[PDB]
Write a protein that binds this ligand. Structure first.
Ligand SMILES: CC(=O)N[C@@H]1[C@@H](O)[C@H](O[C@@H]2O[C@H](CO)[C@@H](O[C@@H]3O[C@H](CO)[C@@H](O)[C@H](O)[C@H]3NC(C)=O)[C@H](O)[C@H]2NC(C)=O)[C@@H](CO)O[C@H]1O
Length: 129
């Protein structure tokens, strides 16, 4: 599923991401935009052999099991495929654990390079929330 900007904002809000660990909604929408272009089925392979999955590009070396990332952890206790669903619940639940792990949203490279320190409120402009 390719979400519309406001449509994703509403689903994230519904799932309790607005101000989760002090990160306003605009931060999450900005991260999704640059990580996957709002496509739940996005996948990208990394040089270490791990793969990033879904709307939030969650990595198989640490958070999910894809059966092909030797000696990786599965901190969210889920198969990576669960993260590609049209329903963002699994991705959001796993995102909450990631952001709480010590580095905040710096765990998302695109957030750190294209969202951090910008006017993120712009990502929720005109949305009915
Ligand atoms: C969205 C996503 O999947 N992002 C990936 C990053 O999570 C990953 O960064 C590494 O993540 C782990 C797990 O959070 C970091 O380990 C944690 O580090 C802090 C101290 O910095 C410590 O308090 C935690 O105990 C420790 N957690 C665990 C479970 O050991 C680790 O520091 C991150 N590594 C780097 C270089 O930033 C990166 C890199 O694998 O991939 C992203 O895709």
């Amino acid at each position: 599923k390719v979400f519309g900007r406001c449509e994703l904002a509403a689903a994230m809000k519904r799932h309790g991401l607005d101000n989760y660990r002090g990160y306003s909604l605009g931060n999450w929408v900005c991260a999704a935009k640059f990580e996957s272009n709002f496509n739940t089925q996005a996948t990208n392979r990394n040089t270490d052999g791990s793969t990033d999955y879904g709307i939030l590009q969650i990595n198989s070396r640490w958070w999910c099991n894809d059966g092909r990332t030797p000696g990786s952890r599965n901190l969210c206790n889920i198969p990576c495929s669960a993260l590609l669903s049209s329903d963002i619940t699994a991705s959001v639940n796993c995102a909450k654990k990631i952001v709480s792990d010590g580095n905040g949203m710096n765990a998302w490279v695109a957030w750190r390079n294209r969202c951090k320190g910008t006017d993120v409120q712009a990502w929720i402009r005109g949305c009915r929330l």
